[PDB]
Design an enzyme around this catalytic site. Structure first.
Site, PDB file in Angstrom:
ATOM      1  N   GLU A 122     -13.047   3.641   4.689  1.00  0.00           N
ATOM      2  CA  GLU A 122     -12.080   3.115   5.663  1.00  0.00           C
ATOM      3  C   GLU A 122     -12.511   1.857   6.421  1.00  0.00           C
ATOM      4  O   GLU A 122     -11.879   0.823   6.283  1.00  0.00           O
ATOM      5  CB  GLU A 122     -11.700   4.223   6.650  1.00  0.00           C
ATOM      6  CG  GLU A 122     -10.828   3.779   7.824  1.00  0.00           C
ATOM      7  CD  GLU A 122      -9.480   4.499   7.861  1.00  0.00           C
ATOM      8  OE1 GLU A 122      -8.708   4.346   6.891  1.00  0.00           O
ATOM      9  OE2 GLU A 122      -9.193   5.214   8.850  1.00  0.00           O
ATOM     10  N   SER A 137      -1.425  -0.590   5.550  1.00  0.00           N
ATOM     11  CA  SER A 137      -2.276   0.436   6.140  1.00  0.00           C
ATOM     12  C   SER A 137      -3.758   0.117   6.219  1.00  0.00           C
ATOM     13  O   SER A 137      -4.573   0.768   5.574  1.00  0.00           O
ATOM     14  CB  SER A 137      -2.097   1.729   5.370  1.00  0.00           C
ATOM     15  OG  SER A 137      -0.733   2.090   5.390  1.00  0.00           O
ATOM     16  N   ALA A 142       0.911   3.870   1.674  1.00  0.00           N
ATOM     17  CA  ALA A 142       1.334   4.128   3.042  1.00  0.00           C
ATOM     18  C   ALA A 142       2.413   3.160   3.505  1.00  0.00           C
ATOM     19  O   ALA A 142       3.517   3.571   3.841  1.00  0.00           O
ATOM     20  CB  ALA A 142       0.153   4.059   3.952  1.00  0.00           C
ATOM     21  N   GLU A 155      -0.848   1.391  -7.649  1.00  0.00           N
ATOM     22  CA  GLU A 155      -0.777   2.769  -8.134  1.00  0.00           C
ATOM     23  C   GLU A 155       0.714   2.972  -8.336  1.00  0.00           C
ATOM     24  O   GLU A 155       1.476   3.094  -7.378  1.00  0.00           O
ATOM     25  CB  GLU A 155      -1.294   3.777  -7.107  1.00  0.00           C
ATOM     26  CG  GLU A 155      -1.725   5.087  -7.758  1.00  0.00           C
ATOM     27  CD  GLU A 155      -2.125   6.161  -6.766  1.00  0.00           C
ATOM     28  OE1 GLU A 155      -2.872   7.082  -7.167  1.00  0.00           O
ATOM     29  OE2 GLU A 155      -1.686   6.090  -5.598  1.00  0.00           O
ATOM     30  N   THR A 199      -5.055  -1.069  -1.725  1.00  0.00           N
ATOM     31  CA  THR A 199      -3.924  -1.954  -1.935  1.00  0.00           C
ATOM     32  C   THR A 199      -3.404  -2.445  -0.603  1.00  0.00           C
ATOM     33  O   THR A 199      -2.795  -3.504  -0.521  1.00  0.00           O
ATOM     34  CB  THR A 199      -2.785  -1.226  -2.667  1.00  0.00           C
ATOM     35  OG1 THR A 199      -3.227  -0.830  -3.966  1.00  0.00           O
ATOM     36  CG2 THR A 199      -1.588  -2.122  -2.829  1.00  0.00           C
ATOM     37  N   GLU A 224      10.198 -15.263  19.618  1.00  0.00           N
ATOM     38  CA  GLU A 224      10.089 -14.783  20.994  1.00  0.00           C
ATOM     39  C   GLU A 224       8.827 -13.961  21.180  1.00  0.00           C
ATOM     40  O   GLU A 224       8.020 -14.230  22.068  1.00  0.00           O
ATOM     41  CB  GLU A 224      11.286 -13.911  21.356  1.00  0.00           C
ATOM     42  CG  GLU A 224      12.612 -14.604  21.331  1.00  0.00           C
ATOM     43  CD  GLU A 224      13.204 -14.760  22.712  1.00  0.00           C
ATOM     44  OE1 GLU A 224      13.092 -13.804  23.512  1.00  0.00           O
ATOM     45  OE2 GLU A 224      13.792 -15.830  22.992  1.00  0.00           O
ATOM     46  N   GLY A 258       0.830  -1.193   0.000  1.00  0.00           N
ATOM     47  CA  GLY A 258       0.000   0.000   0.000  1.00  0.00           C
ATOM     48  C   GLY A 258       0.865   1.243   0.000  1.00  0.00           C
ATOM     49  O   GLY A 258       1.930   1.235   0.604  1.00  0.00           O
TER      50      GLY A 258
HETATM   51  N1  GTP Z   1       1.740   6.815   9.407  1.00  0.00           N
HETATM   52  C1  GTP Z   1       1.369   6.936   8.165  1.00  0.00           C
HETATM   53  N2  GTP Z   1       0.097   6.740   7.817  1.00  0.00           N
HETATM   54  C2  GTP Z   1      -0.126   6.908   6.472  1.00  0.00           C
HETATM   55  C3  GTP Z   1       0.805   7.262   5.490  1.00  0.00           C
HETATM   56  N3  GTP Z   1       0.213   7.344   4.254  1.00  0.00           N
HETATM   57  C4  GTP Z   1      -1.041   7.060   4.476  1.00  0.00           C
HETATM   58  N4  GTP Z   1      -1.316   6.779   5.791  1.00  0.00           N
HETATM   59  C5  GTP Z   1      -2.624   6.423   6.368  1.00  0.00           C
HETATM   60  O1  GTP Z   1      -3.069   5.208   5.745  1.00  0.00           O
HETATM   61  C6  GTP Z   1      -4.399   5.400   5.197  1.00  0.00           C
HETATM   62  C7  GTP Z   1      -4.324   5.729   3.741  1.00  0.00           C
HETATM   63  O2  GTP Z   1      -4.310   4.626   2.852  1.00  0.00           O
HETATM   64  P1  GTP Z   1      -4.235   5.079   1.272  1.00  0.00           P
HETATM   65  O3  GTP Z   1      -3.016   5.867   1.004  1.00  0.00           O
HETATM   66  O4  GTP Z   1      -5.527   5.758   0.964  1.00  0.00           O
HETATM   67  O5  GTP Z   1      -4.228   3.749   0.525  1.00  0.00           O
HETATM   68  P2  GTP Z   1      -3.241   2.595   0.356  1.00  0.00           P
HETATM   69  O6  GTP Z   1      -3.481   1.742   1.591  1.00  0.00           O
HETATM   70  O7  GTP Z   1      -1.884   3.038   0.070  1.00  0.00           O
HETATM   71  O8  GTP Z   1      -3.842   1.714  -0.902  1.00  0.00           O
HETATM   72  P3  GTP Z   1      -4.951   2.233  -2.020  1.00  0.00           P
HETATM   73  O9  GTP Z   1      -6.293   2.550  -1.368  1.00  0.00           O
HETATM   74  O10 GTP Z   1      -5.295   1.178  -3.078  1.00  0.00           O
HETATM   75  O11 GTP Z   1      -4.297   3.464  -2.618  1.00  0.00           O
HETATM   76  C8  GTP Z   1      -4.979   6.590   5.925  1.00  0.00           C
HETATM   77  O12 GTP Z   1      -5.596   6.166   7.120  1.00  0.00           O
HETATM   78  C9  GTP Z   1      -3.746   7.450   6.155  1.00  0.00           C
HETATM   79  O13 GTP Z   1      -3.950   8.279   7.303  1.00  0.00           O
HETATM   80  C10 GTP Z   1       2.128   7.474   5.876  1.00  0.00           C
HETATM   81  O14 GTP Z   1       3.064   7.776   5.140  1.00  0.00           O
HETATM   82  N5  GTP Z   1       2.346   7.284   7.259  1.00  0.00           N
HETATM   83 MG    MG Z   2      -1.966   4.160  -2.889  1.00  0.00          MG
END
Ligand code: GTP
Ligand code: MG
Ligand code: TA1
Ligand code: ANP
Ligand code: GDP
Ligand code: MG
Lengths: 426, 412, 324
Positions: free
Chosen positions: B156, B113, B11, B44, B118, B227, B9
């Protein structure tokens, strides 16, 4: 990913010139020139709107559909007018009569095949197609009728790729046409059942937002258009840029449409301050949400304050704190719990690009799916009945091979569409 | 011995680039040194591209960077079933090609995430296909579950009630770091209303370094990955402990840095420092793995912890006499050259299973219903190879996760 | 005011279930069906009450087995009689993929296993042919369509590869534009059309819906003046795709329409299926639902979901009036 713009009718066309006027500069593409891009990032994703042929000639991948030569011959004889490959111009020298029926069943129906032809040449361009952008006005022939057909065909050819629709719903106060509700009710009908993302703009919601939110005293059309085109750039193209949290047509679609109707939104830009003075820079962020979420500033005619929201998508594009963004959105969701619908814990869909609008420091496109837009289709639907009842200028439709049950159909459909939307306001 | 990692993902990839940064940073391996030991998945391109364009560009093999030019879609279904499917094979291939090359591994640290397309969906089947291809290993998935009030995606919950039920019967130990509850730490314990995602990442990028990095690294009280799950999960539910760090002091403002153990350990149990909006509102701890690093005297610990064991207001489960896995490492932490992290000479990355999440899950489940109750964005999944089944039947799933996290505690 | 009739039917184990040594978690006694959850054996079994309960898990050698002929003579003849009274009627089969929807509605055109549709057609013509009052004349017209990914195909006109447009007549409701409507004067003719239609379907989890419509017209001739008062009843027999996108819009929307009607705006127009069946769901129609159930432990969630939607359907009520 990719998309293929569609300039249906004159309006949708006139706007094409402004949507491309902008977008290009937001991608360093001079008339026929190439990428002069002040940066190097305004290129890694261009594809979304162009094609590689020469090596300095990235040609906009849109379609120009219209039954009135003079128009496209004004867009093609002016500024950026000489960047579209002639193949793009699908004209209909016929009589572009102001009849929805004349551009959807009789006159347009012919020019269609010679359009779909190209819409396929462009779709089968390369890589992977995302969807098509559609501009037009629901108050004329080449716009509501012929453009509303172009989609009904598109959505049969690729019920996979998306369909954003930018409609210039008939402004209230004064109608720039007479049958307006006829050409309109008939096109909204086609919309509620093909495209899956519609952004309704109102020539008078703009004036207002353009004469009081921009002390602008002589808001020419070019302007209105320009403002609109500003929003459609924040939407698409934008998200096709990097971002801490980026989205793309689908995210936008898959986060904004709770129920299949397709639902229509109401776009709103962020920094909308008058030139000199106002250049207050109060754009830390609370200032952008301040903006975007107020009544005035909603390109739509209706006022959000008149009906809950189902979804919202602040598509920001300028370096900011995922904290001061994610945060603000909240208070906003609590100060106005009243109107924001409840069965959706987090209506808002925060989106965050990085690079901002070329010359600006921080902006944020707003795409609202509020139940308020009920009070517009109502309007339209009213105007219809009040005149349908007497079959006003109906002979111009029927006499063009139409049906007395066709008008019935649309109104009802679009009329029911009003109904449903209320099912959530409650 | 090793532990592969699959950052899924955008994130999980941003956090990945981060955790991956902190690494070389404390191992003296600049931009171009050895070779990672993980992979990157996303539907993506533009995001994994950031790892292909930005920093740490050539420290990876275009082979451990999987992308599906296609579409992400903030919806489980599409990412799990429909689209996400096409890539999985290929994905696996690397975690089978990278899993072979090594020498007696221990597992795959997965980075996703929860509430994404994804991230939720895909992984769901990635971890899914792992639990079968290597049931004989550790599956610790490091998640970033839904901000309690500051969520992003409109759906979400749909995406997170679905990644939980599908992964539940496949993970070993699921670490959790709450995006919002980390902001608090950036506001209250570091002071900055300008926290870029790039920061939260530096943080988990820290707490994580305390897990694998340093632990798999020699010390006075080593703690293997196994562990964890052993000393950390009382029951098969892929139980989700919470990550917490101690010296989260600002490298500019205040400076009392020299905060002997006795202090940094107490700073772990105060709820305002745990990368998770699951304030011990009642949740009785049931096992904590206090991973220390830096200059720490075992007595200091086997005392600082003793003092705690008798604070009572910190009530540990009944059926658990002692639930304190003391992990001591040598090398102190390693803060970014000039980010905003203090830089102490000792830290405490304590993680644990707390009857607390009884909440967090609850509050996230409820969300779901509200929308499902109206089908909200359901047509988006159905039309993506899912059914009224998978939803309703994954809801019932978590239901027994609200009862589970309730029964294993609150009762004696 | 007539409530939607609801029947549940449990079938024998299929190959998948036998292969997993599945145990039967469905129990039936009278109008009560109970489902055991294999996951939580010590939790209380859930019970549901329905108008009809068909135990078809064993075989015809069993005294309590519900055969094709018995299912028809029960709910089928009931609906056919309503059609003779002049009411519009509808019977739709609903349930998990492979649960037995098609077997119940169509069955097999061989020895003893014909479903509701063939039997009703045979019964309809047999009754018409036993008429002894020469003041009564009849006409039977049939249509047969398939709904796949919101697109409609005419099963009695395979020559055509275009998907028909679903429209809303300004005064008479939804209809399929240019859908074939053939007059038939014998059971054999209608059965040939049925067989022809069944072969042109696609084409092994179905995700298309099949709608078989019969327009039954009863003409009563009054001797003295020469006006002929008509009596028209539309019989809609639906075989739905199974439950587990544009491929699934109709099924999900039906679930919402069913829930909404049970709760009492309705998203009838949200899908072609609910749009065309609008009047059968909450309009002037005597409607029945046949919920197909797998007996296997492995399908607990899906089966439970079906029992719950069938339970809500029971609560739907429609204002009916005879078409005279
Ligand atoms: N800590 C942290 N949380 C993140 C970051 N990027 C996104 N998030 C969190 O993760 C979620 C976002 O997920 P998305 O970026 O929409 O989606 P993805 O899981 O990458 O996958 P797709 O929906 O298919 O694009 C939200 O709850 C954001 O607050 C990051 O760099 N760090
Ligand atoms: Mg994405
Ligand atoms: C010296 C300076 O900073 O000038 C600014 C400026 O004064 C202001 C007033 C601009 C100005 O915009 C307008 O006056 C305007 C005119 C018609 C319709 C709508 C707006 C500006 O013209 C617009 C221009 O916008 C951009 O450059 C963006 O990249 C924008 N571009 C276009 O709209 C565009 C215009 C002409 C040709 C090609 C593109 C954009 C926005 C969203 C998505 C893509 C591009 C900017 C910052 C300014 C000027 C030049 C004065 C403002 O608008 C925008 C869209 O940024 C109006 O309120 C904002 C605040 C800005 O500070
Ligand atoms: N009562 C029954 N007696 C004997 N066989 C049955 C019975 N019900 C169903 N079957 C069989 O079990 C399978 C389910 O059949 P049908 O084919 O009836 O399912 P659906 O129609 O339930 N499936 P689907 O259309 O894919 O969603 C077939 O092989 C049937 O012949
Ligand atoms: N914003 C905007 N509206 C326009 C433009 N041109 C026409 N319109 C609007 O479009 C409607 C008229 O339809 P028109 O575009 O002439 O139809 P067509 O050309 O026959 O397809 C009126 O409501 C106008 O206000 C334009 O350049 N910008
Ligand atoms: Mg079937």
């Amino acid at each position: 990913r990719e998309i293929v713009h569609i300039q249906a009718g004159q309006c949708g066309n006139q706007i094409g010139a402004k949507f491309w006027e902008v977008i290009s500069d937001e991608h360093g593409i001079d008339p026929t020139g190439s990428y002069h891009g002040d940066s190097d990032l305004q290129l890694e994703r261009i594809n979304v709107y162009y094609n590689e042929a020469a090596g300095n000639k990235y040609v906009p991948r849109a379609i120009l559909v219209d039954l009135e030569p003079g128009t496209m011959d004004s867009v093609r004889s002016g500024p950026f007018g000489q960047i579209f490959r002639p193949d793009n111009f699908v004209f209909g020298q016929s009589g572009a009569g102001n009849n929805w029926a004349k551009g959807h069943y009789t006159e347009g129906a012919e020019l269609v095949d010679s359009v779909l032809d190209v819409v396929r040449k462009e779709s089968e361009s390369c890589d992977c197609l995302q969807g098509f952008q559609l501009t037009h006005s629901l108050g004329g022939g080449t716009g509501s009728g012929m453009g509303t057909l172009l989609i009904s065909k598109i959505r049969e050819e690729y019920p996979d790729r998306i369909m954003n629709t930018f409609s210039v719903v008939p402004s209230p106060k004064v109608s720039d046409t007479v049958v307006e509700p006829y050409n309109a009710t008939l096109s909204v009908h086609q919309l509620v059942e093909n495209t899956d993302e519609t952004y309704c703009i109102d020539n008078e919601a703009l004036y207002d937002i353009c004469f009081r939110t921009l002390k602008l005293t002589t808001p020419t059309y070019g302007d209105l258009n320009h403002l609109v085109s500003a929003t459609m750039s924040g939407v698409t193209t934008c998200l096709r840029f990097p971002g801490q949290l980026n989205a793309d047509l689908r995210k936008l679609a898959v986060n904004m449409v709770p129920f299949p109707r397709l639902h229509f939104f109401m776009p709103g830009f962020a920094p909308l301050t008058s030139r000199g003075s106002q250049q207050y820079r109060a754009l830390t962020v609370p200032e952008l949400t301040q903006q975007m979420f107020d009544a005035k500033n909603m390109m739509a005619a209706c006022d959000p304050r008149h009906g809950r929201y189902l979804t919202v998508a602040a598509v920001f594009r300028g370096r900011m704190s995922m904290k001061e963004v994610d945060e603000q959105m909240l208070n906003v969701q609590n100060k106005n719990s009243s109107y924001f619908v409840e069965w959706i814990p987090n209506n808002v869909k925060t989106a965050v690009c990085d690079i901002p609008p070329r010359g600006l420091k921080m902006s944020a496109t707003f795409i609202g799916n509020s139940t308020a837009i009920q009070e517009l289709f109502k309007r339209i639907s009213e105007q219809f009945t009040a005149m349908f009842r007497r079959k006003a200028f109906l002979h111009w439709y029927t006499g063009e091979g139409m049906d007395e049950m066709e008008f019935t159909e649309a109104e009802s459909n679009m009329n029911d569409l009003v109904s449903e939307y209320q099912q959530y306001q409650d | 011995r090793e532990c592969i990692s699959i950052h899924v993902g955008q994130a999980g990839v941003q956090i990945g680039n981060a955790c991956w940064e902190l690494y070389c940073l404390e191992h003296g391996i600049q931009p171009d040194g050895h070779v990672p030991r993980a992979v990157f998945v996303d539907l993506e391109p533009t995001v994994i591209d950031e790892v292909r364009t930005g920093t740490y560009r050539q420290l990876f093999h275009p082979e451990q960077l999987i992308t599906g030019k296609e579409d992400a879609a903030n919806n489980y279904a599409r990412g799990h079933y429909t689209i996400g499917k096409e890539i999985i094979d290929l994905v696996l291939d690397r975690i089978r090609k990278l899993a072979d090359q090594c020498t007696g591994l221990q597992g795959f640290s997965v980075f996703h995430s929860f509430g994404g397309g994804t991230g939720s969906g895909f992984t769901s089947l990635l971890m899914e296909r792992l639990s079968v291809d290597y049931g004989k290993k550790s599956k610790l998935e490091f998640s970033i579950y839904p901000a309690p009030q500051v969520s992003t995606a409109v759906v979400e919950p749909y995406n997170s009630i679905l990644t939980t039920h599908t992964t539940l019967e496949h993970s070993d130990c699921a670490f959790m770091v709450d995006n919002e509850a980390i902001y608090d730490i950036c506001r209250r314990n570091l002071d900055i209303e300008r926290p870029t995602y790039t920061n939260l990442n530096r943080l988990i990028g820290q707490i994580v370094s305390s897990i694998t990095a340093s632990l798999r690294f020699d010390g006075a009280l080593n703690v293997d990955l196994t562990e964890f799950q052993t000393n950390l999960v009382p029951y098969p539910r892929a139980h989700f402990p919470l990550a917490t760090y101690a010296p989260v002091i600002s490298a500019e403002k205040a400076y009392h840095e020299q905060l002997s153990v006795a202090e940094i350990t107490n700073a772990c149990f105060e709820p305002a420092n745990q990368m998770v909006k699951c304030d011990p509102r009642h949740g009785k701890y049931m096992a904590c793995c206090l991973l220390y690093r830096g200059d720490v005297v075992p007595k200091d610990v086997n005392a600082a912890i003793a003092t705690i064991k008798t604070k009572r207001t910190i009530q540990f489960v009944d059926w658990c006499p002692t639930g304190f896995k003391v992990g001591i490492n040598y090398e102190p932490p390693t803060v970014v050259p000039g980010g905003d992290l203090a830089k102490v000479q000792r830290a405490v990355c304590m993680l644990s299973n707390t009857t607390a999440i009884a909440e967090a899950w609850a509050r996230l489940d409820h969300k779901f219903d509200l929308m499902y109750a109206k089908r909200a964005f359901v047509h988006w999944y159905v039309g993506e190879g899912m059914e009224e089944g998978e939803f309703s039947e994954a809801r019932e799933d978590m239901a027994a996760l609200e009862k589970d996290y309730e029964e294993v505690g609150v009762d004696s | 005011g007539a409530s939607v009739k609801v029947a549940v039917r449990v079938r024998p184990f299929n190959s998948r279930e036998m292969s997993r040594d599945s145990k039967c978690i469905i129990q039936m006694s009278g109008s009560t069906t109970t489902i055991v959850n294999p996951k939580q054996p010590k939790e209380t079994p859930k019970s549901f009450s329905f108008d009809y309960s068909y135990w078809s898990h064993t075989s015809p050698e069993d005294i309590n087995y519900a055969s094709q002929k018995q299912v028809y003579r029960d709910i089928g003849e009931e609906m056919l009689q309503h059609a003779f009274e002049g009411y519009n009627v509808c019977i739709f089969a609903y349930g998990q993929t492979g649960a037995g929807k098609s077997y119940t509605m169509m069955g097999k055109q061989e020895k003893d296993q014909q479903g509701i549709i063939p039997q009703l057609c045979e019964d309809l013509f047999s009754r018409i042919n036993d008429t002894t009052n020469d003041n009564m004349s009849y006409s039977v017209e049939v249509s047969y369509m398939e709904i796949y990914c919101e697109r409609v195909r005419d099963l009695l006109n395979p020559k055509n590869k275009g998907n028909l447009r679903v429209r809303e007549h300004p005064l008479l409701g939804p209809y399929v534009e240019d859908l074939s409507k053939l007059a038939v004067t014998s059971y054999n003719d209608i059965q040939d059309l049925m067989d022809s239609g069944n072969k042109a379907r696609t084409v092994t989890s179905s995700r298309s819906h099949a709608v078989f419509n019969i327009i039954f017209t009863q003409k009563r001739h009054d001797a003295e003046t020469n006006i002929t008062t008509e009596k028209v009843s539309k019989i809609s027999l639906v075989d739905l795709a199974g439950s587990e996108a544009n491929i699934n819009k109709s099924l999900t929307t039906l679930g919402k329409v069913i829930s909404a009607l049970a709760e009492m705006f309705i998203p009838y127009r949200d899908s072609v299926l609910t749009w065309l069946l609008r009047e059968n769901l909450g309009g002037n129609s005597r409607t029945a639902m046949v919920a197909a159930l797998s007996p296997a432990d492995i399908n607990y969630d899906e089966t439970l979901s079906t029992l719950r939607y069938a339970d809500r359907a029971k609560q739907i009520r429609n204002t009916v009036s005879v078409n005279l």
